[PDB]
Design a protein around this ligand. Structure first.
Ligand SMILES: O=C(O)CN(CC(=O)O)c1ccccc1OCCOc1ccccc1N(CC(=O)O)CC(=O)O
Ligand SMILES: O=C(O)CN(CC(=O)O)c1ccccc1OCCOc1ccccc1N(CC(=O)O)CC(=O)O
Ligand code: SF4
Ligand code: SF4
Ligand code: FCO
Ligand code: FCO
Ligand code: SF3
Ligand code: SF3
Ligand code: F3S
Ligand code: F3S
Ligand SMILES: [Cl-]
Ligand SMILES: [Cl-]
Ligand SMILES: [Cl-]
Ligand SMILES: [Cl-]
Ligand SMILES: [Eu+2]
Ligand SMILES: [Eu+2]
Ligand SMILES: [Mg+2]
Ligand SMILES: [Mg+2]
Ligand code: NI
Ligand code: NI
Lengths: 581, 263, 581, 263
């Protein structure tokens, strides 16, 4: 066993080793190992991506116009965000400018994704970490109604409703067929909600499971289908026709009315169901404002997103701010440049990849994806990992760093960047939220904080949906219908050699696609995705990534039941297929 | 009255097939889970993790040996001794084979489980392999598409449960009910195709009138699915209706049949 | 002025005349006149249908296979019921037996219509006679929540919901644009709900306006569209394919799943919103259990409906019983025969039609529709009527009688027939309902009773929907897929001369179509429709119809404000386009 | 801010057009009424009856003279001095003319107001007459169909409110947006039509596979409407999708073009 110091942590692999494999209620495949000391406190944390597909390899030799369709399948949960990054990257390489309505619709696609993704994560992925579903069977339906009504105007709060939900759960479990609730952590002492809050939460789990299906109708209108809508280089293919013959064949007033109806319902659900539930989780779990800080008080990163001025990716255009903080200095938000070779680099000294020199980090335009499954001694065999060897290669995830710093990305990161850049809406939202919880600002830099920020972002995005819709309708009223630029559709119009970067803020954080085009085909296509950052293994300096750091120093009540580990990991909303691609 | 046990496993995947399933409008995925099946194992949705999840897996396949449906999302990679997809420290393929041995029948969700999908596209770095090339002694229902239509997924489940039988299938194992005809055999733009009325460049006058997308690379003429009839997301749209040609996403090898924008 | 005695009433046209023209919150065009005495009691009531189109004339010479489509357009409210009666009549004439699945689907189409029609009538047509919409502005949202929760398990009962609904109404009226509420009867002393019950009812008005659109999705699946779905002679055109190639082109498992989802939602809305609201109106308006009795304690008529045994229209088959009661003898439910020339007859001595002898009634196989607008010695003129002359011709509605008796038809009539035939479900429902109100069984024979029975029937029909769906699925599981019989589709296969009767129970009561075919064409096509019965003018004996009888002896608080007249007329759910056709 | 006044009157009718309107899925009819327009007169829905209703009619058309949209459902009969349709003891046509005189624009809902519909079919006993043959001095937007599609009706209203202008029309006064193309120009059975794949008798094998309804009398080839694209009842179906040919119900005189089952 060894011990070393990094980023204020003492990494110590003495003591009992715990393995959590598979990690569930995430997208894709993850393994986690920790060591705990004699006080059942985590002194070592190991983040491992247990899948790879090789999209960066598959994309070589494709037509750039096709790339969005391939990379969209990096992930079905953050569906569409890779298509957006791809069309941005190809347009940036070739020098294509899209019409305003295309940009607006792309923003609608991204805001819709934020709303949908964040809602499903809150209920279906993270929720059962905080809501004791089986304890809901002990709730008083009338007290449940009273609780709900104290927190929200939401209509669906009757005592009869909560009784009917409870009875549905009772009948479901009565035969022993507990399905997704089988062998859960129910009764664990870290479950702190009262029974009435558990029944309220469970009811809302079911409501959100139903309602999420409606949100993506917006993707179906503009993008054909969800999951995995369609896009084009040069704008969007959903041609508009409001007042001419054949409007039945296009995005017409009836189609736009459908979109408006979804937007209103989406805002109402998020504002009156998810937001109060997130605040309630906060009220009953205040100690988790001091658990899982990890890198969130040290290093956070946002590229920014939602350019409001079409084809302008500058600070005055992006509605979601970009920036980097390092060394805990939130008074100096630093500008990010994705072409600068000294900024974003990926290391593979602790990953299952080959570099000519694994002691140096490669900027994505110099990126290499040469898979090399080489776990070394794992106390088993190459096909039987009993204990990963975190001193050598232990993951299919590359290790991104920003100016050599390990960074956290995602909703908390973005909130902190926007807050410390002085975004008025963010400052007011955060201050009010932490006031309502009777917690200091610092309480946001936590596992609880990640959840709170995610909910508040869902609310932000639902607001922006209406703003973007109104912007679209303003253009249509002024007779501006264009949705595609085709001046540079044909390969004969492209530069023989060019490269470009497409970037955005996915639901889980900072996303970049780096593309090099040569002779009409993709020469290089490198992705660095938010969960790549957060779930990162170590680098040549032994620096730990966001997940490992957030797990460090965490008390476990019951080592064999990893509820605390799940809570913190789920708070980052891991997307493993994204992380590995 | 006991519900039919379903074990849903995940190989190399993007999770689009689970996401499609939860979009179901009728029956709601909620009601499928609470009333129609017993979804006893499913990495994406289940409470238990790690050793608790392993215990569920082992108990279900043992207790309900010969009696559960196995749903497979994603696929096994044969590269690197299968360790491109690791589950409980071992190749995913081991869990696939263990779950398959006890299943009464297997549903291969999506193009991944049916054919290979994007990870299997050239040059297939991981040797991603569809389920029917690994499991060779069980009924496998292929439900292709990237992902399949939500209400098609739930309709197949309801058929299997309600009728207590497998759907009848074509020569490739796809349910005849939803994959018997081509997109182009039920496309509302066929009038335009027959007239030689085509979109020639994006957002041209033809596009704004809903003309046929054949010259923009539509693969509807060679693709079997229900998109042009059933449509997507509770009948709201489908690829062609929103102005993009069919990619061919339900067909074996569609990623490598040339540019989506060429013939 | 004159006075005569009929059916226990003293018909006296001395004294003040009141005119209500137009009658609103009905289908189509009606005028009503009354005389009131010094005590503000109605001593005379005149029912006038103020429209005519002439479908019976238009149908002559048409192909019998097309008839359903024409006669469906008798009415867009009771949409479908005339198509069903038409295909029944033509099948009866030709000798066609449809497959079981076609019969089951037709039963689904009729049950769907019952649910939809009854729901809309309760809220959008009759509701504002009972619910004081402006008084809802004075309610306490919390007391509204408490009331709703005391009556129902329905989820949507939060104080915040009632507050939001109240604020929507407040905003609506704030600009002085009261729309459908302008110049209403608000504040009339006969409005008896407390403010909280008004707000509850108004919230439900809006919920029902939204929800009704969902119910008719069942019509869209099997019949293409609503309003005015499609049908065929020989069955239904919605061919079924569950498990074969091309199921995408037919009624398949996904389409059936959609139907199931709508059935469940329809039952839930009716049982938890409309039923408790009907009971609440009962609780607050018990005096209306003794107002508007009319013919309902003397003569009631049902043909029966919903044949469960395909192509068997007998008593063992019909799920909704047929029968007639006369002379108030509910111990003697009499069988109805629609071919018997001495049973159903229509008179026109007081209608705008020519007969060879207007002092006798004609059975519909001998029917004549020869329009003759002859209002005679009106106050005013033939194009400017101040007062109809009820001593001569005063309506576009013919006067049907059953064995010479004036009958009431519709939900109350059916309820009484089923009750007195000993239908277990009807007896239990009625007894439980009247027990809950602490009212005698006689209290259903009233204006309030017509509303209670209509709500009951919506619940009944919602249950039957599931029963029919299950029967269809049973057949499909057995490989019984047939939906059409075509062996007599071609005119050459028909009798050279034949006649038939098609009958059912429309939402508003007993419907019959009498068709004669000769040489492949419609030779005669006569309709007698439920509102023709209820809104009937007088006959040669001076006998009054159901509306005129129910209006007799009614007290009015304010003569100039016809609230009591509207309450009673609306309780019968008048369909005037139906009545006149 | 005030909402645009709408006066909705009713002639000879079946009330299918009002019924269609309240089916609207997006915007909901509730929201149209509360937030988008001021529905100031409408026999089917209004609280007031008789003299109170007459006062509403008078007050609205006077106070908002020149500023209301007149919606007309049904049509006037010229027979029997107009007394085939009586309102307030006088011919309906007098109310139509009075309402029309004050209107900024008129919407003729349905085949009734547009063309005549079922009461104008041979031998037209009442001499039922479409609105544009009586009102000759005002813009009339014809919105035909029996009835028109719910979400077409609401989209037309949202267009007029949002864009503050009438929809552009064809030479017959129908909005180009929804009536510019034929049913058969966007029908998902066209593949079958083009291949000569037809239903020949009800519930034959062709019918069970969704073949073209042309040989069963479908009038989609000569009918302008949105049913094969927009579809009916929130995208659930349309006549042809549920197995019946188009009757031609959006076209002038469709009742008298011959049997629905003949060419
Ligand atoms: O009544 C039910 O169907 C279910 N019950 C049973 C029970 O209340 O104990 C219930 C239980 C727990 C919470 C809410 C409940 O019901 C709410 C709807 O309640 C009623 C509906 C109709 C008529 C009277 C009521 N009640 C109002 C009241 O429960 O507050 C009381 C009653 O059930 O008699
Ligand atoms: O609060 C609103 O947005 C609307 N109000 C205003 C008001 O209470 O006067 C209201 C009025 C009438 C009935 C119900 C109402 O609210 C229901 C949701 O209520 C809350 C939501 C969030 C946080 C605290 C509450 N409260 C609970 C409580 O009203 O019972 C208390 C509060 O408004 O401070
Ligand atoms: S859009 Fe595609 S599927 Fe449709 S008619 Fe044209 S080529 Fe065929
Ligand atoms: S069903 Fe009718 S509209 Fe469709 S292709 Fe055939 S003839 Fe044309
Ligand atoms: N959100 C998301 Fe997926 C991840 N990580 C991307 O990009
Ligand atoms: N219900 C109904 Fe219409 C009437 N009256 C018919 O039949
Ligand atoms: Fe559907 S998991 Fe998403 S990639 Fe194409 S099916 Fe696979
Ligand atoms: Fe639509 S009121 Fe019904 S008949 Fe044909 S439109 Fe008229
Ligand atoms: S791309 Fe796929 S989703 Fe349908 S329309 Fe084509 S099969
Ligand atoms: S009958 Fe009418 S509803 Fe549409 S499909 Fe034909 S125009
Ligand atoms: Cl278990
Ligand atoms: Cl493939
Ligand atoms: Cl016509
Ligand atoms: Cl034209
Ligand atoms: Eu109760
Ligand atoms: Eu409050
Ligand atoms: Mg990468
Ligand atoms: Mg008649
Ligand atoms: Ni993802
Ligand atoms: Ni009617």
């Amino acid at each position: 066993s060894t011990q070393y110091e990094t980023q204020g942590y003492t990494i110590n692999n003495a003591g009992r080793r715990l393995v959590v494999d598979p990690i569930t209620r995430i997208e894709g495949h993850m393994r986690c190992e920790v060591n705990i000391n004699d006080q059942n406190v985590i002194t070592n944390a190991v983040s491992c991506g247990t899948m790879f597909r090789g999209l960066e390899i598959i994309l070589q030799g494709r037509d750039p116009r096709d790339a969005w369709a391939f990379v969209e399948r990096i992930c079905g949960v953050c569906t569409g965000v890779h298509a957006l990054a791809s069309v941005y990257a190809i347009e940036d390489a070739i020098g294509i400018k899209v019409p305003d309505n295309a940009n607006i619709i792309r923003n609608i696609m991204l805001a819709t994704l934020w709303c949908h993704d964040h809602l499903v994560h809150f209920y279906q992925l993270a929720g059962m970490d905080w809501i004791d579903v089986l304890d809901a069977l002990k709730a008083d339906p009338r007290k449940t109604s009273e609780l709900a009504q104290s927190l929200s105007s939401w209509p669906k709060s009757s005592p009869g409703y909560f009784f009917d939900v409870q009875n549905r759960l009772k009948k479901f479990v009565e035969g022993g067929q507990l399905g997704i609730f089988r062998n859960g952590y129910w009764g664990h002492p870290q479950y702190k909600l009262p029974p009435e809050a558990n029944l309220m939460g469970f009811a809302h789990y079911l409501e959100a499971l139903d309602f999420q299906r409606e949100i993506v109708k917006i993707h179906a209108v503009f993008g054909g289908k969800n999951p995995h809508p369609n896009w084009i280089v040069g704008g969007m293919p959903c041609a508009i026709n409001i007042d001419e013959s054949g409007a039945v064949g296009a995005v017409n007033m009836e189609r736009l009315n459908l979109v408006q109806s979804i937007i209103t319902r989406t805002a109402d659900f998020i504002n009156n169901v998810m937001i109060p539930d997130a605040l309630a989780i906060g009220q009953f779990n205040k100690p988790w404002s001091e658990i899982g800080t990890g890198l969130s008080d040290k290093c956070v990163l946002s590229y920014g997103a939602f350019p409001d001025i079409a084809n302008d990716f500058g600070e005055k255009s992006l509605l979601m701010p970009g920036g980097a903080v390092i060394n805990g200095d939130f008074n100096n938000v630093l500008p990010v440049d994705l072409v600068d070779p000294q900024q974003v680099q990926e290391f593979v000294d602790h990953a299952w990849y080959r570099y000519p020199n694994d002691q140096v980090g490669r900027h994505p335009f110099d990126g290499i994806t040469d898979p090399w499954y080489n776990p070394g001694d794992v106390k088993g065999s190459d096909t039987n990992i009993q204990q990963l060897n975190e001193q050598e290669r232990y993951s299919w995830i590359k290790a991104p760093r920003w100016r050599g710093n390990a960074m956290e990305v995602g909703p908390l990161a973005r909130t902190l960047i926007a807050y410390h850049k002085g975004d008025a809406a963010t400052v007011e939202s955060v201050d009010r939220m932490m006031s309502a919880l009777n917690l200091p600002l610092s309480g946001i830099q936590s596992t609880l904080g990640r959840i709170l920020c995610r909910a508040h972002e869902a609310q932000w995005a639902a607001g922006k949906l209406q703003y973007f819709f109104d912007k679209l309708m303003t253009n249509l009223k002024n007779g501006n219908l264009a949705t595609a630029s085709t001046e540079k559709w044909e390969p004969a119009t492209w530069p023989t050699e060019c490269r470009g970067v497409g970037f955005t803020e996915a639901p889980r954080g900072a996303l970049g696609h780096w593309a090099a085009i040569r002779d009409g085909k993709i020469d290089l296509y490198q992705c660095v995705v938010p969960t790549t950052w957060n779930a990162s293994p170590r680098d040549p300096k032994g620096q730990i990534g966001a997940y490992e750091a957030a797990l460090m120093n965490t008390k476990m009540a019951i080592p064999e039941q990893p509820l605390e580990i799940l809570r913190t990991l789920h708070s980052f909303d891991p997307c493993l297929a994204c992380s590995t691609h | 009255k006991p519900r039919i046990p379903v074990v849903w496993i995940h190989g190399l995947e993007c999770t689009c097939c689970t996401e499609s399933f939860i979009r179901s409008a009728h029956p709601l995925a909620k009601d499928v889970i609470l009333s129609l099946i017993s979804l006893d194992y499913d990495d994406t949705l289940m409470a238990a993790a790690g050793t608790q999840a392993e215990e569920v897996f082992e108990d279900i396949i043992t207790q309900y040996n010969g009696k559960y449906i196995l749903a497979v999302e994603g696929n096994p990679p044969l590269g690197e001794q299968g360790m491109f997809c690791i589950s409980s420290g071992r190749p995913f393929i081991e869990k696939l084979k263990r779950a398959a041995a006890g299943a009464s029948a297997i549903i291969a969700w999506g193009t991944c489980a049916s054919w290979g999908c994007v990870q299997a596209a050239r040059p297939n770095p991981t040797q991603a392999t569809p389920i029917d090339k690994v499991i060779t002694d069980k009924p496998i229902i292929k439900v292709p598409g990237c992902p399949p239509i939500p209400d098609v997924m739930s309709a197949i489940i309801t058929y299997m449960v309600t009728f207590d039988r497998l759907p009848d299938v074509d020569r490739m194992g796809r349910p005849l009910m939803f994959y018997g005809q081509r997109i182009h055999d039920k496309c509302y733009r066929r009038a335009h195709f027959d007239a030689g009325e085509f979109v020639q460049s994006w957002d041209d006058d033809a596009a704004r009138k809903g003309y046929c997308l054949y010259k923009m690379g539509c693969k509807g003429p060679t693709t079997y699915n229900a998109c042009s009839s059933t449509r997507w997301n509770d009948g709201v749209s489908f690829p062609i209706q929103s102005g993009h040609g069919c990619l061919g996403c339900a067909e074996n090898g569609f990623w490598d049949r040339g540019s989506f924008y060429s013939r």
